[PDB]
Symmetry: C3
Subunit: 114 residues, 3 copies
């Protein structure tokens, strides 16, 4: 799984340990081992959400499986909770796009996962 | 809806008001209220388009519905017109990927839109 | 086709010529002409892959066709080889998400490719 967060929050507000904590929490939530988890945080962005430039986040979670109605609700609670707690972004100012990737469309280590 | 623009145009060439104007124009084009619109501009990028590093843009519009053949043609005219007018990027150096997101695959406010 | 590379490798480690070489090699691999190829490199990112912050890359390749099981295996060998050779990123520290785009969902030049 791969989680990306783009936000207008400044780099100095991203706490040390945030990528590690995302890795561990996503491993637990997806059921996939941490060895397979990639995380990416992109601060200082120029963005607006609902006509305001107050703190917000545009995110995405891509996974080979483990994506669906109930799981996504559960991810959204978890990930909004983390972004609220660590980056002070209110949950109603976060979008998370979920992608269920086909194994044949994910490359890694000179091949794909098919 | 969420609109992202990645470009090699410098940050000082993005006019003040560009994010608000994108918000308003996208609200009108998609028929969705501005409260639901998110916009993200990423300048100063290292990129090339057709073997040239002249001004270009790689963009995406994600929306829960309101994506289809005719609408997308209409969005592309609108968006290329704005990028040409405001950032001085020629329309033939812009790509816009359109994604029709399932409500169950978009998180927000601790849950999804399903 | 559009190829994007997000990496924690520093900007000074991206060699001159890297975007041109990506353009050329992607043109040969996809069979599409270089006029249609767009490439984007984003260095200095805050990221982790498998619980480590050693050099890694999160990438994507979007193409109107030319995406499938065998082609993606081929692309992944090619692109991991380039990233290993030019940016010193090990292949097992790279993810590449492949997207087969519908022509009606790609805008360019005030219209779409449908």
């Amino acid at each position: 799984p791969m989680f990306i967060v783009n936000t207008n929050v400044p780099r100095a507000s991203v706490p040390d340990g945030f990528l590690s904590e995302l890795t561990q929490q996503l491993a637990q939530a997806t059921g996939k081992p941490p060895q397979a988890i990639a995380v990416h945080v992109v601060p200082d962005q120029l963005m607006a959400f609902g006509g305001s430039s107050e703190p917000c986040a545009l995110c995405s979670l891509h996974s080979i499986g483990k994506i669906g109605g109930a799981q996504n609700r559960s991810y959204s609670k978890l990930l909004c909770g983390l972004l609220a707690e660590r980056l002070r972004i209110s949950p109603d100012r976060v979008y998370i796009n979920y992608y269920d990737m086909n194994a044949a469309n994910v490359g890694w280590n000179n091949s794909t996962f098919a």
